[PDB]
């Protein structure tokens, strides 16, 4: 029989370009099926109705049911590509940052404030104009804040007095904007938020994707901290610029993968002092608009697959050569 791989996300995410076009890219395995599990299979019926799969392609995004993910696969025990349960911390930007620092990972100087919602004011801050302390540690600015959930994506930037004060408010991109300056200079009262040191970089940052722990594609964006204006090229998508890796940042992408189990992980850097800070852990994400990177991504997942599963099932298979880049 066929090996089936199976993927399972929200519909927004396996009917994406960037998975139809990986996908039918694995399907010219001679020995692989693709299955995608429909959405409403996903949200409505029961595990033990939803498709086998002998490797299972999993990942949470917004109103993913990612407890039923984890029943399934403890219920037919699949390959798993990108592991379930780590999941759950990457939502949680405290859990990265921990798992981070234990792989001696390099990341900005960072403190967490936990507040009580019913004692928001008993908590471990003190403001002054131009720093604040959290749990005794000394922030000057320019600092980050950042929420704890990591599907929050309202990170602020705190500027000193002597750049004019005030903030810039982050957000997920909306139209043209990706930022906003506010003439808010005081830190926000409610939540739990990271503190953290600001890198300064060239005014870009890294993005890297890796497909396993050996290979990695990054490409720079303009930091939306800068102004907020996000540029487009003639076609209206988001201006990216080429990026290498240098031998201590490939390591970076191959801790990363390894430490959250993730083989298809994106991941930011933070080139800065003539180093690389990693300041965020995204799990599962594609290139878009690479026909190489849709090239490769497809050819190394099918390869991961028919080493773990050729054996199994009987079919011969010599371990390929692949690109690292
Ligand atoms: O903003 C956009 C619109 P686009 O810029 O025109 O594509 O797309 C974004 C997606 O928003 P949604 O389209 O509503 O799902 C978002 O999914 P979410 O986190 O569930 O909101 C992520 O996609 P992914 O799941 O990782 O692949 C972001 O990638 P990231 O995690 O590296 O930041 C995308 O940004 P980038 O495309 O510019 O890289
Ligand atoms: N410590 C820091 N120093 C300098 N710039 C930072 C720092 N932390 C974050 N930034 C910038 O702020 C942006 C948003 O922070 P990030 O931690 O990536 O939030 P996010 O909401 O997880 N974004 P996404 O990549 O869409 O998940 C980053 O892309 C950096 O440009
Ligand atoms: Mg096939
Ligand atoms: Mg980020
Ligand atoms: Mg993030
Ligand atoms: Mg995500």
Known sequence: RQIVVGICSMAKKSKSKPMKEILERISLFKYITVVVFEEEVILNEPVENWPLCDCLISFHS??????????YAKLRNPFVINDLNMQYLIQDRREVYSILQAE??????????????????????????????????????????????????????????????????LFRKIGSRSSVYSPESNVRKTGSYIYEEFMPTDGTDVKVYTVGPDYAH???????????????????????????????????????????????????????????????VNGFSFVKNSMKYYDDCAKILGNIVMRELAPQFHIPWSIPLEAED
């Open 218 to 280: 990054a490409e720079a964006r303009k930091s939306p901290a800068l102004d907020g204006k996000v540029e487009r090229d003639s076609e209206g998508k988001e201006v990216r610029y080429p990026v290498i890796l240098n031998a201590r940042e490939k390591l970076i992408a191959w801790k990363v993968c390894l430490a959250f189990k993730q083989t298809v992980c994106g991941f930011d850097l933070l080139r800065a002092n003539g180093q690389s800070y990693v300041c965020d």
């Open 104 to 169: 001696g990972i390099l990341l900005p100087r960072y403190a967490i404030l936990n507040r009580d919602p019913n004692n928001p004011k008993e908590c471990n801050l003190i403001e002054g104009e131009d720093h604040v302390e959290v749990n005794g540690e000394v922030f000057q600015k320019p600092f980050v804040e950042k929420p704890v959930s990591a599907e929050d994506h309202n990170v602020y930037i705190y500027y000193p007095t002597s750049a004019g004060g005030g903030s810039q408010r």
């Open 62 to 71: 917004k109103g993913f049911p990612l407890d039923k993910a984890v029943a």
